[PDB]
Design a protein around this nucleic acid. Structure first.
Ligand code: ADP
Ligand code: BEF
Lengths: 84, 95, 99, 563, 111, 88, 98, 111, 96
DNA sequence: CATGCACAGGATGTATATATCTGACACGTGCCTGGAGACTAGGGAGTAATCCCCTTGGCGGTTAAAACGCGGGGGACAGCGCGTACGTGCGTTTAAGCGGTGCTAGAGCTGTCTACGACCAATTGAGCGGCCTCGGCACCGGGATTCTCCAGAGGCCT
DNA sequence: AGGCCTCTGGAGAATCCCGGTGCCGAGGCCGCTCAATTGGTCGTAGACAGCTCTAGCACCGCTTAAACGCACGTACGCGCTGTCCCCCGCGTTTTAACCGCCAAGGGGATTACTCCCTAGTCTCCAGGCACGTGTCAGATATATACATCCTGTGCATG
């Protein structure tokens, strides 16, 4: 029954650097991190808000992987490896 | 406990052993294949349903399936799939 | 003898060659789990998360961010620069039709 | 009593004092009187004299008589583009004391003419207006609408045979006191299209379309007990009723009894046989293979190899009729894509591939041996191009008219060819563009390269070289392809004529054909078929000349008009 | 008197299960009738596609001197080929990684 | 006396002429245009058209007709990913 | 000398006009000929209703217009104002169409 | 002795046809069977959306000093709102223009 | 021979218009576009509800599925007003 | 006299090769539930026969875009110089990560019972083809208002 | 003696409203009929209560890899100038769409008639799915040989 605050700061800079390298970037500016965090939050909000809606309809109280994989498929991107 | 769940596990293994005699597969790849088969099946059936509906037909016949394949698969893959389907259906009737 | 030190830019290429070979996960576990839990608290008050869903969410997020950065890098070369800047990300997201 | 000439002169002077170019003929004077009577009684009417009898001069005389009494007024004349200059010249010749203008040209020029010569106030100096169809169609709404048109003459009336025609709708904006509708072939293919002219001329009478449809019976019921003789009785009654309801509004006269001094003419059909080259194309087209005439691996483990699969290590009946017609006309019309902009084949190769072209080449050489001059008609310009190229290769003179030739160029060539000093002997014409109005009395022979679906069109084309002023016998040669689709179209065409003969009078298992169509004409017969002696006019008191050649024979057939 | 039963898959010569596809089609409410011919066609098509993918995956695996397939191999096989990549234009494979690729401008000057 | 050269017509793809491309560009909000775009636009358009004509023809073929109709084009567009109103 | 505008003025005037009208821009008959030519490759002797040709036109025109709109942003990005082919190629590449 | 019949739409207070929606929903095989409450719920939503779009369309048409609505008005009404625009993000409307706008950089200098 | 009739929402769309702008009228093309719009919306909602019901192994379709589908599809504020309208309609229908 | 190229070694960061040892992946049973033979009604769907619409090929004419050609201003590229804002390293800190135990809470089965929703017949009237009639728009033609674009005067200097 | 410019101050060219006739597509009206309504059964999905028992949510401790601050250079980003070719604007003509008009006939829709595939029941039985074991690929440890990146003299200035 605790409360959570300011966890978005947990995406450390080296993690973003490592993510960028896999994409083929060579040299990175100083202002990218703040933009990236906002983009990530915006992306997550939409998926969570549909997974929750799917769950509540069946009157369950626990979210399950099937709901998440269902939610993604509606937004035009499919995921292989968790169910069908 | 022990309530059965169905999947395409055995047939993928049979095909694999038919192609590469000595190779094996880990569980993760098995899950990916199991999902891929369902996805393709659903796509084809969904397309065939509306394709039949547009013409006031009631049944779903082999012709609808043959037409549906030519719309989904791109270019080269279309030819061989149609050939295999026709061969299988032709062999089935005379048995 | 001076302490041997590479010229700027060399280590970046080694990192690029290394991280494109492996398939590990790049973000930490617990911080991401806490972040996921925090957001959902607005829509319902006592949600219970199955241990498998979090992995799927993390995979989707990483797969999205990697592609976004890849497109940004191409957008950057167009102006003869090599460092990516917020303008490039904004332009890429505008072109893709998300904004 | 005075002689015919003196009486005609006196009557003309009494009725048409302004007319000075030349004397009118008796029947022309009678037509003038008929028009005067119709005008006096305030009733419209059609004039349908046979082609080449001089309707223009009669209309000019009537107009001069009208203005001769001082009834100055705005007069409008509409005619096909190619004839306007002829109308202007006729007025300039016969009545020098009248003015006319050719209201034609670009917008700015038309406005200039309007401002200069057409004052808003009518006066004795007001000239007659002449125009084509399109100009009268575009400018009706906002320019010509502002005049009180006293009298209107619409030449070539048969252009209004469709009641849905736009031109027939635009004219309603104008207001006209009276209408006159000249023509040469009043009765078109079917009865419905005849009602349009009558409705336009006299709306107060022929209002209902369905009444006009039902007034005549074409049921063709079985010859039951009460119908055995009805087949003829009903037909006779219908014909009599039609004539009786059409007598008071139409004037008709025929050459055969009005101008006995004019030499006669004949129509002749000559056949040709297809060559092997054409048969090959026919067979390919029937089998749907004309284009063709002009035209697996196993991966390891035995599976079929997908095409262009990468192999690299991962580490590190729709239009058959028109096609057949094109093939029958000339093979080269097809295969127009193989050589693109490149040249036509060699001259000698063109002749050898088409039977009709071979026959035409054989026929032409003999005619020049006797100083004759010929006109050649066609429907498709691309076909005219091949003949033009052939004649240019042979180095002969040529003159040509068609839709792509401008007005002034059209006018110049006719005048040049009519000159007696001209050495030209070949003249080309398009059927639709040059078949109407113009005068080409210089020549005395006509050739029809192909037959239209509508027989009436050909009748206009044949008469372009047989009219008042001619002095020699005339022959008309129509070519056709033996044992081909051409016969079907030609057979169907004449089927539409029987209705005309029924309705309009002259005043107010091989079959025999298979034994004749196939036979090509031999040289001995051909050199004998060209005699025109029998068509000459007999001297008074002398017996008629005997028939030159039988009615029909191998490869040829004369045509006798239905009577 | 009953003759010995033979599975439809055996008579058609395929490997995939014909009966299960037929059951799925009817229970899926795609239409109120299902012809006798469709299941065989569908099973044959699915078998062909599966064999096509597995043949390339196996070739990819043997290159690295491994013996059992893992997701990286499927990712390589799918993304290297032409048609398959177009077919799977919007699919993400768990733990797939990405193909090696570096823009030419970033490489060090040859000098 | 026409010369022995046949008549010739411009290639069909050339029917789309430069002023039309310029007019299209202006509606997009373009001020200055380079000289080479006139060869890229035609290439793009020709590629675009086939991906729709093929599906339209397949839909027509399935129904055993011989004439294409509006509904086939609408269905092809909708399946490809773009929806069109005003022709149903 | 005769009145003569400076470069660039007429383009803005044309832009402010063509954005106000809804009529079609490409001529009809050439487009119909092109459509007939392309289809004939896949199957012979087809027949087209007019409304199908109209639909194809109005579908393609609005695609080209949008493509040109997305291209212009790239040009401004590189500090230029003219369009060049590389811009179109980059726009299509990012869109994921190739 | 049956009483006077009253349409369900009149009983519910809506304008759209309940019966036609119910028939379409049944015959379309969207599910095995249809409850009694669904068509009433669906008709209200359809009516609300139609009225919502028509109000803006009419306002835009009136603003231009004209009486009858034409597609240009629908285009202007739809594309000027940030919600209807998101709902119709992929739809194309025949004979509709585009919103007028010019990038600031292209405008001429102050002089 | 006129047996081939066609059905459309023209009458109802026209009826709704008079409730907002009494003195306005609509041309044919706008009517056709509006008619096409309704079919698209209806198809989307019904299609979503169909698969939503099957996911839980339930057989029938009830107002709950329609409500959830509407909540999923329509973005932002439109959801609230639509849901309120639907519930207000159904509650009135039931009581009579 | 401050440049441009050739090599030397010489420190680091990969891929060789050999040895240990887990814990998945492969194979066996023993049932069951679901697939596979016979049999019986029904009605979609195939197949003639027939109208009437709407499509396909070609000529005539006009006239408003399309093609060419010429001047000239400005925008697209090279070059150079200045000065930050990032990229390799080295210590110091902080928080993941692993490895064990407790609990409940909440997700799955099982057995009832009932209100809800398919089907049939008999009814009407709400919804669709036709068909007039008139105003909103659609030309025209003519006088305003905006907006560019270039030459001369004199601020304030040099 | 000579600039560099605002600021006019016109002068020419493009929309813009304002009044006046013409026209044909929208809005009611009418007639007709086929698709919703109204009662009635009948069997069933679907609530509802009562039980198992799996896992997610906490807590504690401990090693110990990633974070997190500095303090240097340096190579890239940005701005300012020149030069030169290329695109825009405006005049003359030539070329091809738009209609207008001629003919014909293929293919789209209906309406009857008949039959052979599919649905829905029964038996009957064997193929696929949880539990259960047993080896050997592949993940780690270590020795190191090789390849790659970097700077400091060398040469040639002449
Ligand atoms: N009275 C005449 N004197 C001389 N030639 C005449 C006379 N009447 C008619 N013609 C000739 O009739 C020829 C054509 O006139 P016309 O018959 O009216 O043409 P069409 O009937 O075909 O419309 C003219 O060349 C003209 O010379
Ligand atoms: F008017 Be006529 F036929 F020259």
């Amino acid at each position: 029954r605790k409360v959570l605050r300011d966890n978005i700061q947990g995406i450390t800079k080296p993690a973003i650097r490592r993510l960028a390298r896999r994409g083929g970037v060579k040299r990175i500016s100083g202002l990218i991190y703040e933009e990236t965090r906002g983009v990530l939050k915006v992306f997550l909000e939409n998926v969570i808000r549909d997974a929750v809606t799917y769950t509540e309809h069946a009157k369950r109280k626990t979210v399950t992987a099937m709901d998440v994989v269902y939610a993604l498929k509606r937004q035009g991107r499919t995921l292989y490896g968790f169910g069908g | 406990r022990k309530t059965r769940k169905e999947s395409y596990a055995i047939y993928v293994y049979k095909v694999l052993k038919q192609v590469h005699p000595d190779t094996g597969i880990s569980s993760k790849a098995m899950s990916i294949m199991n999902s891929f088969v369902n996805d393709v099946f659903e796509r084809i059936a969904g397309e065939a349903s509306r394709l039949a509906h547009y013409n006031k037909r009631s049944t779903i016949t082999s012709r609808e399936i043959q037409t549906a394949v030519r719309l989904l698969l791109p270019g080269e893959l279309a030819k061989h799939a149609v050939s295999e389907g026709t061969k299988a259906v032709t062999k089935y009737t005379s048995a | 003898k001076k302490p041997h030190r590479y010229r700027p830019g060399t280590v970046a290429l080694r990192e690029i060659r290394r991280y494109q070979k492996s398939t590990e996960l790049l973000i930490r576990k617990l911080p991401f789990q806490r972040l996921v839990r925090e957001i959902a608290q607005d829509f319902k008050t006592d949600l219970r998360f199955q241990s498998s869903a979090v992995m799927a969410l993390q995979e989707a997020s990483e797969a999205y961010l990697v592609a976004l950065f890849e497109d940004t890098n191409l957008c950057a070369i167009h102006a003869k620069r090599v460092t990516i800047m917020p303008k490039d990300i904004q332009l890429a997201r505008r072109i893709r039709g998300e904004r | 009593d005075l002689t015919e000439e003196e009486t005609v002169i006196k009557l003309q002077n009494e009725l048409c004092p302004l007319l000075t170019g030349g004397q009118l003929k008796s029947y022309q004077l009678k037509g003038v009187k008929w028009l005067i009577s119709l005008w006096q009684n305030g009733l419209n009417g059609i004039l349908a004299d046979q082609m080449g009898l001089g309707k223009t001069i009669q209309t000019i005389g009537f107009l001069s008589h009208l203005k001769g009494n001082g009834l100055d007024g705005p007069y409008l004349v509409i005619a096909p583009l190619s004839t306007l200059s002829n109308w202007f010249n006729e007025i300039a010749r016969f009545t020098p004391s009248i003015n006319a203008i050719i209201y034609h040209g670009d917008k700015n020029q038309r406005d200039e003419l309007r401002r200069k010569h057409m004052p808003k106030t009518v006066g004795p100096k007001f000239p007659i207006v002449i125009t084509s169809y399109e100009v009268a169609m575009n400018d009706a709404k906002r320019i010509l609408r502002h005049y009180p048109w006293k009298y209107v003459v619409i030449d070539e009336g048969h252009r209004l045979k469709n009641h849905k025609c736009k031109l027939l709708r635009e004219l309603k904006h104008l207001k006209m006191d009276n209408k006159l509708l000249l023509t040469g072939t009043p009765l078109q293919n079917n009865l419905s299209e005849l009602w349009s002219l009558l409705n336009f001329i006299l709306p107060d009478i022929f209002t209902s379309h369905d009444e006009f449809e039902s007034w005549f019976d074409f049921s063709e019921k079985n010859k039951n007990e009460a119908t055995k003789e009805e087949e003829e009785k009903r037909r006779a009654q219908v014909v009599s009723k039609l004539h009786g309801i059409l007598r008071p509004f139409i004037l008709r006269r025929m050459k055969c009894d009005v101008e006995l001094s004019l030499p006669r003419k004949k129509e002749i059909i000559m056949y040709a046989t297809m060559t092997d080259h054409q048969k090959k194309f026919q067979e390919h087209l029937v089998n749907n293979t004309l284009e063709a005439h002009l035209g697996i691996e196993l991966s390891p483990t035995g599976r079929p190899k997908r095409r262009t699969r990468k192999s690299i290590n991962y580490s590190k009946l729709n239009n058959l009729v028109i096609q057949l017609r094109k093939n029958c006309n000339h093979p080269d019309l097809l295969q127009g894509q193989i050589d693109g902009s490149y040249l036509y084949p060699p001259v000698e190769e063109i002749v050898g591939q088409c039977g009709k072209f071979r026959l035409l080449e054989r026929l032409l050489v003999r005619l020049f041996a006797n100083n004759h001059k010929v006109l050649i008609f066609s429907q498709w310009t691309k076909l005219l191009d091949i003949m033009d190229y052939y004649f240019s290769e042979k180095g002969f003179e040529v003159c040509r008219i068609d839709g792509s030739v401008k007005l002034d160029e059209r006018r110049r060539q006719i005048k040049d060819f009519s000159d007696e000093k001209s050495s030209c002997s070949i003249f080309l014409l398009s059927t639709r563009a040059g078949g109407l109005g113009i005068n080409l009395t210089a020549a005395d022979t006509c050739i029809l390269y192909d037959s239209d679906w509508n027989p009436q069109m050909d009748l206009q084309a044949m008469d372009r070289c047989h009219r008042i002023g001619q002095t020699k016998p005339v022959h008309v040669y129509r070519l056709s392809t033996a044992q081909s689709i051409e016969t079907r179209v030609l057979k169907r065409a004449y089927s539409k004529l029987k209705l005309e003969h029924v309705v309009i009078g002259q005043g107010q298992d091989e079959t025999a054909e298979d034994k004749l169509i196939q036979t090509d004409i031999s040289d001995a017969d051909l050199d004998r078929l060209l005699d025109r002696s029998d068509l000459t006019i007999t001297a008074p008191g002398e017996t008629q000349a005997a028939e030159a050649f039988p009615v029909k024979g191998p490869g040829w057939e004369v045509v006798l008009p239905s009577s | 008197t009953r003759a010995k039963a033979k599975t439809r898959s055996s008579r058609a010569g395929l490997q995939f299960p014909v009966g299960r596809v037929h059951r799925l089609l009817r229970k899926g409410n795609y239409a109120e009738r299902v012809g006798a011919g469709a299941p065989v066609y569908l099973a044959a098509v699915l078998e062909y596609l599966t064999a096509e993918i597995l043949e390339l995956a196996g070739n990819a695996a043997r290159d690295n001197k491994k013996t059992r397939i893992i997701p990286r191999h499927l990712q390589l096989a799918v993304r290297n080929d032409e048609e398959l990549n177009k077919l799977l234009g919007r699919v993400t494979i768990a733990q797939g990684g990405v193909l090696p690729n570096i823009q030419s401008v970033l490489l060090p000057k040859k000098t």
